[PDB]
Amino acid sequence: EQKERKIMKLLLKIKNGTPPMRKAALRQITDKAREFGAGPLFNQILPLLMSPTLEDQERHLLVKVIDRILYKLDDLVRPYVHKILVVIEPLLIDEDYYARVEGREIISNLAKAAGLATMISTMRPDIDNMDEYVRNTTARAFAVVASALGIPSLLPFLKAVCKSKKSWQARHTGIKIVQQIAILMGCAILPHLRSLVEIIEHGLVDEQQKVRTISALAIAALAEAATPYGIESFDSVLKPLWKGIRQHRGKGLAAFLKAIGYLIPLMDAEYANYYTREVMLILIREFQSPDEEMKKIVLKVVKQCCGTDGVEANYIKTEILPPFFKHFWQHRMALDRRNYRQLVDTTVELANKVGAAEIISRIVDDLKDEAEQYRKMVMETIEKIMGNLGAADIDHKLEEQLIDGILYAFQEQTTEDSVMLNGFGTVVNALGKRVKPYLPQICGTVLWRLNNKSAKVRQQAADLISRTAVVMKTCQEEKLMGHLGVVLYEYLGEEYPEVLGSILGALKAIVNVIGMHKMTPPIKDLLPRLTPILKNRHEKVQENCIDLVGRIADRGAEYVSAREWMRICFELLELLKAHKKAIRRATVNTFGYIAKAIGPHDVLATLLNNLKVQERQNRVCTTVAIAIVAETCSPFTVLPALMNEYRVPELNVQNGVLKSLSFLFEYIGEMGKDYIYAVTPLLEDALMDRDLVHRQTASAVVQHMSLGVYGFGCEDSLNHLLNYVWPNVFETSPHVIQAVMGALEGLRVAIGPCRMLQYCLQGLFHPARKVRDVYWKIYNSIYIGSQDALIAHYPRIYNDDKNTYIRYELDYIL
């Protein structure tokens, strides 16, 4: 009927149309859902999710509106909990991070809003379902719902399910639930570890292969969730696991090995060492297994065993390194992804534990292999080892072999990846002074890679130069660095944008490593060459050139004429519409250095004229620029211009200058106590009931000044400012409420809680309700912070004939 006839229109409005229309439609959906109900609304919403042709955007919007309407409704979704659950199950079973996060949030909201009894009633029957996908999604649902509202409320229920005898399916489901709780909760199951261990023990004893495998997985999950402590609660599981290790084979063997490897770090050093010695024979017997999953499992087990302190370097080297290294270095197993990452992690952990010497000395030869994946793997291991351990263990032979290997690897640059550059940079940084003889070779190779076939490999060459400039400068080869700089200077005419950005980054690095006065290119000609680069449109070149000219202004401002200073300021104003925030921050920094170098008159006049762009993106940037100019220059030479610009009746100009005053007061801090008197008439004018934005800006200025001048005795003007700020509490807009609350908090921390208590005591018991509510919230805000002074600031209340309200202990006289 009419209730349903108003549903599809809103659905088509929110699914089709401009964003304003769908936002408004969502607004009256949220507003009118109190009278709409839940029954027909869900009866119409759910078939939309049941549509096979559902899209990502439609599903996301519908789940969001369902989440909001369910948050609004406390206990009005009880009859449809089962439907919501069974329709969210496909949403959460998906392999999308955002989708599964939204699904788990939905189920948590279901658990919080709805009672446990109805959930149990609609929840029990599907535990013993024959289909496996529904069992998996129901296991995820149990995990999230037990995460909500706490696990102990349903822990005995889980024990009862796991103690089932009718079929092994119920025990499998219960062990899956325990594993899911272990994998999701993390550290929230530590107090309840013993009961879960006892529950999983008898399932482990069970003869069913699936049941014992899932029990081993649950034990491993519990161990990894209780990694720091919990061996005392796990010492009763070791014997069946050892029996399975010594008897079972196949997938069960893999699960038991994973469980024991997870449990090994839990115990002490001696027990872990003995168990690693026991399992090393089986590990060696299993290394050459064709299965990739088992190889990954044994790699993880080996890494965990090696991470423990029970083993020793000599023993591990003489037992496990030769066979593992012989059977775990092949291209066929290197072609994988999970095997790739697991092998990298295992090798780097082993190198950290036992040492890097041999583990790099007998892989530098393999670095020469023509395979690109093998080269990438060995270089990743090398760079991880260099970053983690260090490089103070290399002799001449190993270091020259490593240099030859890295040079050969970089020479055969076939794939497109930055890992090449990262590895080379880490290697050269780790080597330090010991690589100084070889620098001409790298210089020649990088030059040869630079000058060929029209700027394609020049990107990585310039990135490499920028990365290695530090060691290049510390190698005392100043003439070579100057030669590279000047050559790259005439190589500035490249049309390619990414190549130009790499060139700009390399120029930044070379001018940063060495002093600017020693740079061979002409700066007086460099700036006119960089100005067209400033007029470029690509983001990378724009940010690089803006930071470069910021460095120019910071250091090399003496050799730059004021005419081109003003011009590049003009294109800085023009460029302020950049999308990236880093570009805008660098731009306002450039204004700061320029105004520090030259008198803040022309730049200030140009900045003050950019407050009429009809877009707040440029206005805030100009505000920050004006604030930084006033901070880096004399404040008393900027304020009169700010007031003169305020004199115009332009609302945008007034808002900009007020924000500039707020930012300046925030930046200067305690030094600005002398300028408090100069801005009092402006604050009084802004605090007048004319514009909400004016009141917000005035409150922000008051709060910033109060925080800045706190502790220096400036209460005379602060009290007068509060006298006008206070009548702004009665507002409805959230932004002005937040600004007023911040201003009053600053005035409280500056003046003291006594005056705030005096003001808030006027209407704490007012006959009306809204004034009482706002006074109570203000009083709570005051009472939360600096409570120890209100006791002295409390007033005196006369006691009644039935209760005592007078503290007689304070009336004692000595």
């Binding site: 009083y779 709570n780 939360i784 409570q787 209100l790 006791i791 409390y794 309200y805 202990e809 004692y812």
Partner: protein
């Protein structure tokens, strides 16, 4: 919607909190501050010919139900 810190604090009033709760909270805070401050406790123990232990014991007993019984 940052009211979590408001609700997670004990000793502050709200919309329909009566006078009795406010006064008993004030008395409890005053007693706790008296106990914390050594100088005021010493002043109290000097005013009456007693000991600091007895004064703090009596102050602890006064924390059971200040301002008479609830109405």
């Amino acid at each position: 919607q940052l009211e979590h810190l408001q609700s997670k604090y004990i000793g502050t009033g709200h919309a329909d909190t009566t006078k009795w709760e406010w006064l008993v909270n004030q008395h409890r805070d005053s007693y706790c501050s008296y106990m914390g401050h050594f100088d005021l406790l010493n002043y109290f123990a000097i005013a009456e010919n007693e000991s600091k232990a007895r004064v703090r014991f009596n102050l602890m007993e006064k924390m059971l139900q200040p301002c008479g019984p609830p109405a």
